[PDB]
Design a protein around this ligand. Structure first.
Ligand SMILES: O=C(O)c1ccnc(-c2cc(C(=O)NCCc3ccccc3)ccn2)c1
Ligand SMILES: [Mn+2]
Length: 308
């Protein structure tokens, strides 16, 4: 069965250390850049409100067939497996919890994170069992607002919430403008509504950017990360073992389907670290750190690429 990778570093900054995000990330870099990803737990009293327009939040999530790569005799009428379904935040959550409790035959919060992890990777490689889930991925914060409070006058902010609108850890306040000559001659966060087994495959960011990720609420998001010094190693294992039909594809397209069991990478000598990102915790990915992961259950994440 699946062997969990070693845990990535988790930091619990003091209030003093928590004042400036870029200063903090710069200070932890000697360790975190060697693990690709790290987790940051804010002080216990730092609790931003959830500021999305919940009443109107509607979306059509993308369908994810866990074993689509292993599955590569064409099945009758491929391309039409799943009927389309639009959800509200509430109705997606009802669907997500029902899916998970039915799947495991127990209440959603009683399913061990290790079991969802072992079962996810079993399902990804299984040809006997076709599990299909849905992911409310890549929803712009412009559509219904950020999960963080923002002083743009579109939504009421209470006095005790203003510090969160102004915080450097509010993802809308991270720096995003890359320096360049073109910048002198001539981005917002994205939202992710997850359910059990919804997932993201191995990738790095455009321009080898840092990214930062905040789980507003819900069940954990499980991460795997590879340090940048091993990026070429991972890419070589992909070349060797990924489907030949996709071998010649540019990285930007190949990354849409680069699913790989972390143990395969580990057996080929690639260092992999894991973490369960819980509600109220940040994950930071360092430049050219490959990462992938899946959601343990119904949850809500916000993410943005930032520059140093
Ligand atoms: O899902 C997450 O929590 C997550 C975590 C870390 N990074 C990403 C991420 C996604 C994209 C992206 O646009 N993907 C295409 C759309 C997409 C397809 C399946 C799953 C999630 C997105 C680019 C860069 N990073 C997503
Ligand atoms: Mn990413």
């Amino acid at each position: 069965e699946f062997v969990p990778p070693p845990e990535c570093p988790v930091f619990e900054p003091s209030w003093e250390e928590f004042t400036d995000p870029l200063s903090f990330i710069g200070r932890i870099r000697p360790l975190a850049e060697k693990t690709g990803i790290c987790k940051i737990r804010p002080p216990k009293d730092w609790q931003p409100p959830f500021a999305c327009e919940v009443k109107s939040f509607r979306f059509t999530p993308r369908v994810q067939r866990l074993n689509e790569l292993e599955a590569m005799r064409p099945r009758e009428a491929f391309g039409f497996e799943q009927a389309v379904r639009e959800y509200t935040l509430q109705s997606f959550g009802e669907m997500a919890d029902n899916f998970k409790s039915d799947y495991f035959n127990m209440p959603v919060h009683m399913v061990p994170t290790e079991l969802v992890e072992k079962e996810f990777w079993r399902l990804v490689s299984s040809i006997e069992e076709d599990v299909i889930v849905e992911y409310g991925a890549d929803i712009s914060s412009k559509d219904f607002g950020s999960g963080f409070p923002v002083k743009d006058g579109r939504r009421k902010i209470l006095p005790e919430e203003e510090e969160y609108a102004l915080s450097g850890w509010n993802l809308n306040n991270m720096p995003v403008l890359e320096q360049s000559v073109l910048a002198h001659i001539n981005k917002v966060p994205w939202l992710y509504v997850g359910m059990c087994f919804s997932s993201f495959c191995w990738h790095i960011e455009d321009h080898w950017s840092y990214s930062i990720n905040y789980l507003h609420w819900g069940e954990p998001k499980t991460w795997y990360g590879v340090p940048s010094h091993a990026a070429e190693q991972l890419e070589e294992v992909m070349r060797e073992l990924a489907p030949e039909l996709f071998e010649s594809q540019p990285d930007l397209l190949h990354q849409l389907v680069t699913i790989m069991n972390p143990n395969v990478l580990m057996e080929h000598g690639v260092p992999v670290y894991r973490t369960n990102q819980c509600a109220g915790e940040f994950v930071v990915t360092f430049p050219r750190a490959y990462h992938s992961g899946f959601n343990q259950g119904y949850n809500f994440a916000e993410a943005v690429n930032f520059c140093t």
